[PDB]
């Protein structure tokens, strides 16, 4: 019933980890519009380092392609490809 | 015990 | 090599996702304390509701119990345990 330490320590050490992100937090100058889904998930570095001085930055970055809803007030429905930026690798380092 | 490395257990006891 | 709507869509919909959360946020009266992780990974409400009326907020909870290391001035290394909350169930609700 209680997590050990080297679990938790392990768990949430700098690593890339699936984060839910909203388009506008991304690309915030097309709030104009609206999308569905409104947010998508990508894998972005998270987690804490051994230390405050060090920051958990990606080593690795890539893009990806989803299939995104985007329509403007009384205007039609649009389905279409946007690229998002992803982390597949991440360490600790100064800041 | 590099402080740029996830740790194993003797560097947090000793 | 791009994800379809409805992947996005399921993946991205409000639901419990495995959050990295800084633990002072979760105990703000041991403000003056170094803890070892400094961050934990804990189940919490994520994602959107696909309507600016609606937002995604937890429905059930329980309590996790986890070792952490704890150091402050005029005292040395310690271990114990913390309890944190979990978001179990989240629903799309009217803000
Ligand atoms: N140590």
């Given at each position: 019933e209680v997590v050990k330490f080297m679990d938790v320590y392990q768990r949430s050490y700098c690593h890339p980890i699936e984060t839910l992100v909203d388009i506008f937090q991304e690309?915030?100058?097309?709030?104009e519009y609206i999308f569905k889904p409104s947010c998508v998930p990508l894998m972005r570095c998270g987690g804490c380092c051994n230390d405050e001085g060090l920051e958990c930055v990606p080593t690795e970055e890539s893009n990806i392609t989803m299939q995104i809803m985007r329509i403007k007030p009384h205007q039609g429905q649009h389905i279409g490809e946007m690229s998002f930026l992803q982390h597949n690798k991440c360490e600790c380092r100064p800041k | 015990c590099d402080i740029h490395v996830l740790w194993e257990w003797d560097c947090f006891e000793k």
């Open positions: 690309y915030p100058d097309e709030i | -």
